[PDB]
Structure formats: structure tokens, C-alpha cells
From a paper:
KRAS is the most frequently mutated oncogene and belongs to the protein family of small GTPases that function as binary molecular switches involved in cell signaling. Although KRAS could serve as an excellent target for many cancers, no therapeutic agent directly targeting RAS has been clinically approved. The main reason for this is the lack of druggable pockets on the surface of RAS. The shallow, polar pocket situated between the switch I and switch II region of KRAS (SI/II‐pocket) is of particular interest because it is present in the active, oncogenic form of KRAS.
The complementary “kinked” docking pose of 12 b in the SI/II‐pocket of KRAS encouraged us to generate a sub‐library of 1383 rotenoid‐like “kinked” molecules with contiguous fused rings from our corporate database for a second virtual screening campaign. After visual inspection, 7 compounds were selected for NMR testing and the racemic compound 15 showed NMR cross peak shifts. Both enantiomers 15 R and 15 S docked with conserved indole binding modes; hence, the racemate 15 was separated into its two enantiomers 15 R (2R,3S) and 15 S (2S,3R). Enantiomer 15 R was successfully soaked into the crystallography system with the crystal structure confirming the docking pose. 15 R binds to the SI/II‐pocket of active KRAS and forms two chelating H‐bonds to D54 with an N−O distance of 2.9 and 3.0 Å, respectively, and a weaker third H‐bond to the K9 side chain through the carbonyl group with an O−N distance of 3.4 Å. (D) X‐Ray co‐crystal structure of 15 R binding to the SI/II‐pocket of GCP‐KRASG12D. (E) X‐Ray co‐crystal structure of 15 R binding to the SI/II‐pocket of GCP‐KRASG12D in green overlaid with the docking pose in orange. Of these, we confirmed biophysical binding to the active form of KRASG12D for the tricyclic indolopyrrole alkaloid 9 b and the indoloisoquinolinones 15 R and 15 S. Importantly, we elucidated the binding mode by determining the protein–ligand complex structures of 9 b and 15 R with the first X‐ray crystal‐soaking system for the active form of KRASG12D.
Numbering used by the authors:
A (entry chain A), B (entry chain B): 1 to 167
Write the structure that this text describes.
Amino acid sequence: MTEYKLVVVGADGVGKSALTIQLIQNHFVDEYDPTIEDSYRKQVVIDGETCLLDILDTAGQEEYSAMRDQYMRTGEGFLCVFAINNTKSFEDIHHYREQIKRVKDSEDVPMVLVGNKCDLPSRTVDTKQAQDLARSYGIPFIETSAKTRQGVDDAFYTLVREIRKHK
Amino acid sequence: MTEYKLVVVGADGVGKSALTIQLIQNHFVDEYDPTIEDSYRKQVVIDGETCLLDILDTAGQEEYSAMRDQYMRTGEGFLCVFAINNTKSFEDIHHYREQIKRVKDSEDVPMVLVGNKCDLPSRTVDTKQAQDLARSYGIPFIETSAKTRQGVDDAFYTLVREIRKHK
Ligand SMILES: Nc1nc2c(ncn2[C@@H]2O[C@H](COP(=O)(O)OP(=O)(O)CP(=O)(O)O)[C@@H](O)[C@H]2O)c(=O)[nH]1
Ligand SMILES: Nc1nc2c(ncn2[C@@H]2O[C@H](COP(=O)(O)OP(=O)(O)CP(=O)(O)O)[C@@H](O)[C@H]2O)c(=O)[nH]1
Ligand SMILES: CN1CCC(C)([C@]23NC(=O)c4ccccc4[C@H]2c2ccccc2N3)CC1
Ligand SMILES: [Mg+2]
Ligand SMILES: [Mg+2]
């Protein structure tokens, strides 16, 4: 059974936990409970292959930024999440990508750019600007909603495909 | 900050995941999604001390019984869970206690016996029989409901107190 080590990263409040809980448990968490570090081991069928997904739901709080080095060394693919109504979270993406690239000493780390909270009308980051950034990195870009489940399966399955396509 | 490694063990279906998710997320999970291995970190105040709880939600499925060795070696305290409406789950408790005792090579391992699903009218295990088993082990016994939250905080806090006493 092929195991995929996925790490969900991004600024504090973008919806990393809500995305993960939506994927695994099929419901939306309305409450905001800041994460320290949670992990999930889930069996899924992707393109007819039984995959074991090891998902690390990380802290967005900068107080736990020293914890990053270890999960960036062990993680195989990174879901880089920003919120479409949070411009700072979109600017923070570059810092996460640079740190991952440094830790792995590689320009070709499996990554997917995720623009979460696409159900909200309060957009501050244009889809075209996020598309252009993902193109500059050579990575897929997907918009998601942890509330409606729009794009959630696609975001995680695309990351598994990036780890698989890189392999 | 004092860190406590808590491991939730017991038969497949007793409510290990629902107890853990209730404690951390204040949410009851009605669905049955068999666990492989999930972990959570949570900061809590117990008797005026800020505790970091590292909770391991383990597989009840006997298919993953080989995974027990590693978590029984690293775990500091064990929440041994049975369901009050499942006689077999109560019978399985002694196997978990024996395995933990063997791995640790000790009769004094921090443990709490938990009789879950106390909200259900379909009781098959008498509170007195469970109290007697906990007495034979020299451990606390608490009845809980992951649905109503009855005894949930008490079960986890008591386990932390047992680790503190052991130390
Ligand atoms: N409308 C909407 N709200 C969302 C979405 N995803 C998350 N939220 C909300 O945003 C808040 C933060 O979500 P959460 O999943 O805790 O984000 P996080 O990135 O894990 C926060 P931390 O970095 O501290 O762990 C919550 O109120 C949650 O309901 C979404 O797609 N749409
Ligand atoms: N009424 C009631 N139902 C509960 C309670 N705790 C768990 N359940 C239910 O029992 C079922 C199994 O719960 P779950 O948390 O998955 O048990 P588990 O021991 O983790 C199963 P596994 O060992 O395979 O991971 C679920 O349908 C859940 O809603 C409870 O206290 N009261
Ligand atoms: C992705 N993994 C990372 C490790 C994990 C967080 C872990 N924490 C550890 O410190 C540790 C260290 C060595 C082996 C096993 C463990 C686990 C463990 C055992 C007992 C109780 C809690 C618990 N949580 C589980 C999830
Ligand atoms: Mg979170
Ligand atoms: Mg479970």
C-alpha cells in the first residue's frame, strides 16, 4: 500500500483544519480553535490505487514556526493554503514555499496552491493573481471551500498526484 | 510547559474517537469511521497548571494490533475504554491492560478505566462489575458519554493526574 505524507500549511485562520476535517469527516467546523499539531492516517482510493494518506494539520500561529523544519523534512507534498479574503495569507505563501525549498534543498517539491473560503463574497485576492503565482512556481492552483466541499477532494487528490507524478 | 502523552485504547466501536473529538472539538461524531492512527495536541489548564496534552487516538481494529508496541512504549498514560452496552468490549479491557503491563514491564502504569456510552439505555455491563475490575488494577473508573460530554473532561484530567502521581 502506497503511503503519501501530506502537510497542510498556511497562515493562521486560512482554514487548514476546516479543509482537513471536511476531507476526512464530511462536515464543516464553524468554530476557530487554533492548532498546535494534529495528524490523521486515512485510506482513500485515488485513480484506482488504495492510498494511505498521512495528513499533518500544522499551526498557522507564528509562535510555532520553529516546529516547521521537522515536518518540512518528512513531508512529501505540501498543501499551501491561503484564504481568498485575506491578502496577508496570500503574501505569506511565498515564505512557506521558500522555507520548504530550503529544507528539502530542491526547486521541485510536490505542492498545490489552495485559495480557500471561495464561498465568501468578501474576496481580496483575484483568481488571476493566484493563478499567475502558481504558474511562476510551476504548481497547480485550486480554489476551495471547506464549507461547501467545493474543490476539497480535488485539492488533496491533486497533491497526491503531484507526489506520484514527481515519483 | 509540562507535556503528557495520552493514549486512548479499547475495542473497535467503544467510542475512542468520539471521546477524543468531544474533548478537543466540543463536537459529537455520529458516524463510524474506523481509525488507523490519529494524533492531537491540546493546551489545557488542569488544577491551575498549563498542560500540553499529546493524545493518540488508536485503532480498535485487531488488524492494526502490531502498531500497539510503539505507542505502548512511548505512551505515558492510557485511557482504557469499553462501552457499557457492549459486553465483549468490557471483556477486551483485560487484554489491553495485560499488553500495556508487559510492554512497560510494570504493574504501576498510569491508566483510567472508562465506561463509555452511559447516555444509552441498553446497558449490558453493570457499573459494579466495572468498579471491581478498576479496583483489582488499582486505577480510577469513570463513566462517560461522548454524546452529552458527561465525564469526558473528568476522564482525561484524571489520567493526567495519574501521570503526575506516577512521576
Ligand atoms: N466561509 C468559510 N469559512 C471557513 C472556511 N474554512 C475555514 N473557515 C473558518 O475560518 C476560521 C478558521 O478556520 P480553521 O480551519 O480553524 O483555520 P486554521 O488555518 O486551521 C487556524 P490555525 O492556523 O490557528 O490552526 C473558522 O471560523 C472556520 O469556520 C471556508 O472555506 N469558508
Ligand atoms: N450514544 C453514544 N454513541 C457513541 C458514544 N461514543 C461513540 N459513539 C458512537 O459509536 C460509534 C463508534 O464510535 P467511534 O468513536 O468511531 O469508536 P472507535 O472506538 O473510535 C472505532 P475504531 O476502534 O474503529 O476507531 C459511532 O457511531 C459513534 O457515534 C457515546 O458516548 N454515546
Ligand atoms: C505523526 N505522528 C508523530 C508522533 C505522535 C504525535 C506521538 N508523539 C510522540 O512524541 C511520539 C514519539 C515517538 C513515537 C510515537 C509518538 C506518538 C505518541 C505516542 C503516545 C502518545 C501520543 C503520541 N503522539 C503521533 C503522530
Ligand atoms: Mg488549524
Ligand atoms: Mg476511532
